[PDB]
Amino acid sequence: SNLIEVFVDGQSVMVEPGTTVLQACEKVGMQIPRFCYHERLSVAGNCRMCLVEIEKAPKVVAACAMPVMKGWNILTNSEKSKKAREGVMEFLLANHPLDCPICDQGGECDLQDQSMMF
Amino acid sequence: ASATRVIQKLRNWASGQDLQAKLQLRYQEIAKRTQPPPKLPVGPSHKLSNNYYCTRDGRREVVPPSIIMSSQKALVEKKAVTPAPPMKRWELSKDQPYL
Amino acid sequence: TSVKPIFSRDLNEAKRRVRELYRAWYREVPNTVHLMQLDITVKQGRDKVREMFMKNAHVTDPRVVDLLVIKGKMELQETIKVWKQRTHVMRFFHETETPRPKDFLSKFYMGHDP
Amino acid sequence: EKLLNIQPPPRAQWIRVLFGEITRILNHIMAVTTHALDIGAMTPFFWMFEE
Amino acid sequence: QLITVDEKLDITTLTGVPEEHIKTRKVRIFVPARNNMQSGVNNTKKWKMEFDTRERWENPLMGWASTADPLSNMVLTFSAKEDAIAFAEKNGWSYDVEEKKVPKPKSKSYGANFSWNKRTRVSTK
Amino acid sequence: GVQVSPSGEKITHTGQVYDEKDYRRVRFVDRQKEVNENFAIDLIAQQPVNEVEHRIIACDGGGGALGHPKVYINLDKETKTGTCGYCGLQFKQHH
Amino acid sequence: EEMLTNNRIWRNRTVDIGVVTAEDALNYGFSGVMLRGSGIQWDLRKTQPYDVYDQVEFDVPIGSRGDCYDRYLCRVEEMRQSLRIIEQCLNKMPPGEIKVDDAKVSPPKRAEMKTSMESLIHHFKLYTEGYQVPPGATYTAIEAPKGEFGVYLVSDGSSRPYRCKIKAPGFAHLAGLDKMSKGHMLADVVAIIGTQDIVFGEIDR
Amino acid sequence: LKKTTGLVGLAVCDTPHERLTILYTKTLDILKHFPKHAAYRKYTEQITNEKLDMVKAEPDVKKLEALLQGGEVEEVILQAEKELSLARKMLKWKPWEPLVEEPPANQWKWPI
Amino acid sequence: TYKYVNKKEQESEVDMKSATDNAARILMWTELIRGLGMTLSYLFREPATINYPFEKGPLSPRFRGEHALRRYPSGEERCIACKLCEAICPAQAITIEAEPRADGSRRTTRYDIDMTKCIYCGFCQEACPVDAIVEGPNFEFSTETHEELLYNKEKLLNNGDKWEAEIAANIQADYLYR
Amino acid sequence: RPTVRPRSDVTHKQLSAFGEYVAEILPKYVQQVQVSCLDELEICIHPDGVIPTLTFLRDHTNAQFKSLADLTAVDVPTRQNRFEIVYNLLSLRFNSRIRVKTYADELTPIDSIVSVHIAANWYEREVWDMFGVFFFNHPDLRRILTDYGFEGHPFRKDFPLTGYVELRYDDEVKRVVAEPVELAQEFRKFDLNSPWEAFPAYRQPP
Numbered sequence A: 001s002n003l004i005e006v007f008v009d010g011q012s013v014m015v016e017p018g019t020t021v022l023q024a025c026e027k028v029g030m031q032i033p034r035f036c037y038h039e040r041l042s043v044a045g046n047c048r049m050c051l052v053e054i055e056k057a058p059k060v061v062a063a064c065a066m067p068v069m070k071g072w073n074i075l076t077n078s079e080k081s082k083k084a085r086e087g088v089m090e091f092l093l094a095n096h097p098l099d100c101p102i103c104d105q106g107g108e109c110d111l112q113d114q115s116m117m118f
Numbered sequence B: 001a002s003a004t005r006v007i008q009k010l011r012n013w014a015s016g017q018d019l020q021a022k023l024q025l026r027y028q029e030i031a032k033r034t035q036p037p038p039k040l041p042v043g044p045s046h047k048l049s050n051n052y053y054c055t056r057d058g059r060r061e062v063v064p065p066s067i068i069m070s071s072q073k074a075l076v077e078k079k080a081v082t083p084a085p086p087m088k089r090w091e092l093s094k095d096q097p098y099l
Numbered sequence C: 001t002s003v004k005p006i007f008s009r010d011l012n013e014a015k016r017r018v019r020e021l022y023r024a025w026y027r028e029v030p031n032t033v034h035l036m037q038l039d040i041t042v043k044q045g046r047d048k049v050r051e052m053f054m055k056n057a058h059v060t061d062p063r064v065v066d067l068l069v070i071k072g073k074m075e076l077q078e079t080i081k082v083w084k085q086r087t088h089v090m091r092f093f094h095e096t097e098t099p100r101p102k103d104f105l106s107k108f109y110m111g112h113d114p
Numbered sequence D: 001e002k003l004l005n006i007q008p009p010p011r012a013q014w015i016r017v018l019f020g021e022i023t024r025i026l027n028h029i030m031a032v033t034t035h036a037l038d039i040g041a042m043t044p045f046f047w048m049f050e051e
Numbered sequence E: 001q002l003i004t005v006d007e008k009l010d011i012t013t014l015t016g017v018p019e020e021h022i023k024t025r026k027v028r029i030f031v032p033a034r035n036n037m038q039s040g041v042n043n044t045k046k047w048k049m050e051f052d053t054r055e056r057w058e059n060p061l062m063g064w065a066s067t068a069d070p071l072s073n074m075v076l077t078f079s080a081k082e083d084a085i086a087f088a089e090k091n092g093w094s095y096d097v098e099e100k101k102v103p104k105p106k107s108k109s110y111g112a113n114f115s116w117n118k119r120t121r122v123s124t125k
Numbered sequence F: 001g002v003q004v005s006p007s008g009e010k011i012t013h014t015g016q017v018y019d020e021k022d023y024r025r026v027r028f029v030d031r032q033k034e035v036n037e038n039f040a041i042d043l044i045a046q047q048p049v050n051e052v053e054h055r056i057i058a059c060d061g062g063g064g065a066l067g068h069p070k071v072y073i074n075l076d077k078e079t080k081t082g083t084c085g086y087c088g089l090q091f092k093q094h095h
Numbered sequence G: 001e002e003m004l005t006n007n008r009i010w011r012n013r014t015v016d017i018g019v020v021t022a023e024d025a026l027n028y029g030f031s032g033v034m035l036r037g038s039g040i041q042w043d044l045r046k047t048q049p050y051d052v053y054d055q056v057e058f059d060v061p062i063g064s065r066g067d068c069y070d071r072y073l074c075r076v077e078e079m080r081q082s083l084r085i086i087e088q089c090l091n092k093m094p095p096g097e098i099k100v101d102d103a104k105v106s107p108p109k110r111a112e113m114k115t116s117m118e119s120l121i122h123h124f125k126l127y128t129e130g131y132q133v134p135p136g137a138t139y140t141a142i143e144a145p146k147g148e149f150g151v152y153l154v155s156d157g158s159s160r161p162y163r164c165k166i167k168a169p170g171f172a173h174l175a176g177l178d179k180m181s182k183g184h185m186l187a188d189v190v191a192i193i194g195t196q197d198i199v200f201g202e203i204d205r
Numbered sequence H: 001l002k003k004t005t006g007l008v009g010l011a012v013c014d015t016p017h018e019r020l021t022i023l024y025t026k027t028l029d030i031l032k033h034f035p036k037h038a039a040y041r042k043y044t045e046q047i048t049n050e051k052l053d054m055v056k057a058e059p060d061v062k063k064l065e066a067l068l069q070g071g072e073v074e075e076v077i078l079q080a081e082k083e084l085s086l087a088r089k090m091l092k093w094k095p096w097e098p099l100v101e102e103p104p105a106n107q108w109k110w111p112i
Numbered sequence I: 001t002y003k004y005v006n007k008k009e010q011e012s013e014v015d016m017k018s019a020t021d022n023a024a025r026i027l028m029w030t031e032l033i034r035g036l037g038m039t040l041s042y043l044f045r046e047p048a049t050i051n052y053p054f055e056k057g058p059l060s061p062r063f064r065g066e067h068a069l070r071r072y073p074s075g076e077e078r079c080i081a082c083k084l085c086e087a088i089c090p091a092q093a094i095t096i097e098a099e100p101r102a103d104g105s106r107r108t109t110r111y112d113i114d115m116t117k118c119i120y121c122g123f124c125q126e127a128c129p130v131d132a133i134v135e136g137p138n139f140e141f142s143t144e145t146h147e148e149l150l151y152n153k154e155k156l157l158n159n160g161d162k163w164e165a166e167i168a169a170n171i172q173a174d175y176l177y178r
Numbered sequence J: 001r002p003t004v005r006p007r008s009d010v011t012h013k014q015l016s017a018f019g020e021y022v023a024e025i026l027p028k029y030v031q032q033v034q035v036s037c038l039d040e041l042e043i044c045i046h047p048d049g050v051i052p053t054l055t056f057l058r059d060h061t062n063a064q065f066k067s068l069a070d071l072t073a074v075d076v077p078t079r080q081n082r083f084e085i086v087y088n089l090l091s092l093r094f095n096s097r098i099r100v101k102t103y104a105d106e107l108t109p110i111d112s113i114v115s116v117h118i119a120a121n122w123y124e125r126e127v128w129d130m131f132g133v134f135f136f137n138h139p140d141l142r143r144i145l146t147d148y149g150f151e152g153h154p155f156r157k158d159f160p161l162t163g164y165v166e167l168r169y170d171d172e173v174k175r176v177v178a179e180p181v182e183l184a185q186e187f188r189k190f191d192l193n194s195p196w197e198a199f200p201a202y203r204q205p206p
């Protein structure tokens, strides 16, 4: 009934169409990192931090934009879904000026964590 | 120091062992202050390749415990069991056995 | 609700177990005040005691009452002996701190105290 | 370290044992001697508290 | 053996808490807000039960800030709202609940930024 | 080398002196008010601008392991200059 | 030891004093010096080794004839047999690293937080937020001079703990104070305190 | 022959193979009261018969130790008294009763 | 390895050769002499006392003592209100309320220590990413009032305006070392 | 792999199989034996069967756990039986440990173990001082740590850090008197609990 079988490390989820992989994974709790995305602004994959290995794929997808089709199993804590992040945050942190103590957003930075977490 | 080569024999006769060589306190030939500045060693993973966080993350290799009854979920000849071999009576302390 | 009971059944059996304790505190105001000197004579000490049992009369649960006897026995077991001092026994009274206005009108000339 | 699941490195483990049995030497000296003070012997106390 | 009773389950005598911090002490049960600076949301999923606030005067010597109510910095993490009220009623405190604020499931189609007909035709890609 | 109230008390880095109608000045009676005369805002303008080459550089606080994490600046402003929030230095582009 | 351990005033002030029964110690859980001083062969450093104690070649000075002179001789020789441990813990120190390689569980090199960005952020969150342990629980242990000092640390995903607890080994030694001083007078009760090692701060919380 | 144990308070009370037998034999004889299906009963038999095959065969105590692992036999003797009380103290208890008294939900899921 | 501290009781056929040697260890006292003649040695030894205010003892350049706010070599207060030198301070000892400086820059209006708090633990000198706060060799700063220890900031600069001649040599031997 | 505290897989099975050994032998009052990745055992039970499992563990050859180390009381003020009370023992003969924990409300007393382990003479009592959890058959229950006039049970999570009293010397009466609590600095509760679970596959779905 306008619902699609989707898998997240084995979950038997059902979701409306036109939904991202986030809006699926967000149900369970596999909260994906985010820099280009907001829950209310238009979609634009520029950060390329929300990557994940969909099961049975050589290429990853920007989950912010990639909608969700039947039979797709995600691997959020794969090696390939963390290599995709340890690299990314290790790119951002090459033009960033180390100003955290100067920075107004010390504990309210959504990057300091997401360099720690992943 | 200024031990006049008699009281040493008074100390040692009154105490025992020749203790001018193993005296109480320190004078010299120790800790010649301002040792040079050291260039430390570095730890591993300063190696720039085959160095991810996945092959070092100590805290994501843990998992929840492995429950074995789970009074509603699992709830599931045979030999006796102990948590280990009953370990040994050790030894009897060679080179200083009875002190 | 089919609870485990402890030391008694429905209240009116626990109410004599109470009185075993008042049966001690009522006879251990005069022994304390003399053995370790104090200011109270004997009486306002006894008023304070009953003023504590006429704080917990609102209780209606046997398990709670069977518990509150115990903490009274401890303080009794601490009071019957000299393990306390002249500062602990005379601590209940709230002698020093000014009692706040129980009314409304004087209660907010000092303090945002609803 | 159990919870985090880490063995610290050897050199730090190694010194953690060294002071880990100099502190052993302390409390003995503090309860060999104080066990002698309150029994009465006040001298070895001072012989050690330069040591 | 067992005994029957159906009562309110009061405990307020077994804590001290003499008179002021029993009655005249509201309590707020809620799911804390998403710190809108951060897009991270793990501070939700819980039912913190912080209490109201009272005077925080200025210590006239140092400029320090000081208080009278020790019962002000009193976070408590719970797991379900049905359990929170049972905990606060068990100590007689006038709970004041706020409900969850679930966000909606919204449809966000990337291509619809790039419509012919429609009005969502974004600029700057 | 500080500025002083009409009541006669010493001002800090910040304007901090109590008004006349203030019982706080008691604590200075038969004592004195500790103060540092070394206002940073006075010392720092008494420092020449380092007129370097290329538009972008690194700064430090006199020793790379010894202060001022290596922040950079874009020195495109010929009108004003560029600062580093740690220090209070200033820079130009030379061109 | 020239002076005390053949001293009448020591020995008959100390010997036959506070006779501890072996199997009763365990009922009280002394589990430090105060049982090995009655012949219960035991030491975590060799019976449940954790750190680099695995290669030290040392010894445990058991005490028989439970009394506060054979506790005393244990307390002496445990001072000596650090020096076998030191000499072995001294002449083979490996060159290596300190403050574990991971920057999430250790702060980084102070010269390295100051250029390399990531080492700065961790330095900004270690010393504000911290480790972010996993939930779980342990009961560690270590034989300090007192005995089985150990911690029942209990955790939660928040950076902060959730009811740590400290196992004060003296805490049980002192509960046995009023059983081992039975048929003995005052003056040795002083000695009982010293040969239970009341470094109060363990006892106090 | 054995002068003293390493322990203290645990006296000698010599002549093993004598008090060790009578204790084990009685444990089995206290058993035959339990159910066959109560799982306690079908393990101690493996403990004691294992231990008793080795005392009933070997007269040498030195080699009897390191053979029923746990040395200082008189600690093993005391350990048999220790077993003995457990059985008779546990018949009045009932470990083999039916299923648990059903604790409440979400009573051990730790991370909170 | 387990070592009997005291296992020497064996019936050695105690004869008059030796059993009276214990009586020679007794009534003609010798073990007491042995414990006495020792002590007599030390009074002929070098007493390790020192005339403190004229002879002060040894320290090392990492000694945790009195705090001080350092300053750059060109004026310019080195502290910049990061607010992790209290978030780590386990004593909860500190309040460092801050603002812009009126230069547009970033500095404090407030800085504090209760030195009766401040366990002198060393977290703040090392957590400071700038070495703006440090913990210097003063340990003669006992005062007669609990109030004169509540160092605000002007003391704690002009203290840092004092030992900077000293700290910049201990730290000179302690950079490249932590 | 260097920095991961090597697992030493084998003793999990010893403590797992032995974990089963205690269940099927004692199926009454025993729920969810388990074990963490840290090879250390945990056994949750019902309060009516406290002793008969202890005495199995003090008195049985295959479970010589005749030495007690702690008896704490852990708060969970969101369930019914908020107070998880924990035991933890040790074999001198088998060289391993265990953990035997239970539960209680603010009033569902637990019969004590002092006939079994007298080591718990005072560990039991602090819980009475620190949480107000009565025990049956315990000799001379009374306060340990708190003042002789301290109401409350402070290690409860309901009791604030700085409690409800502070003492001082009011010279008019020549005593160390108490009056209500009046700070000078106000301990500053921080929100150091970031987002980002940090531990997936280890968590709570709604």
Ligand code: SF4
Binding pocket: A096, A097, A098, A099, A100, A101, A103, A104, A105, A106, A109, A110, A111, A112, G121
């Ligand atoms: S707080 Fe975040 S945004 Fe600010 S400097 Fe640090 S990493 Fe960059």
Ligand code: SF4
Binding pocket: A101, I078, I079, I080, I081, I082, I083, I084, I085, I096, I127, I128, I129, I130, I131, I132, I133
């Ligand atoms: S002392 Fe250091 S860490 Fe603290 S605010 Fe100043 S510069 Fe920042």
Ligand code: SF4
Binding pocket: I085, I088, I089, I090, I091, I093, I113, I117, I118, I119, I120, I121, I122, I123, I124, I125, I135
């Ligand atoms: S030394 Fe430690 S306790 Fe003292 S102010 Fe610094 S961080 Fe706080």
Ligand code: FES
Binding pocket: A033, A034, A035, A036, A037, A044, A045, A046, A047, A048, A049, A050, A051, A062, A063, A064, A065
């Ligand atoms: S978070 Fe930027 S592409 Fe998805």
Ligand SMILES: [Zn+2]
Binding pocket: F059, F060, F061, F068, F084, F086, F087, F088, F089
């Ligand atoms: Zn700069």
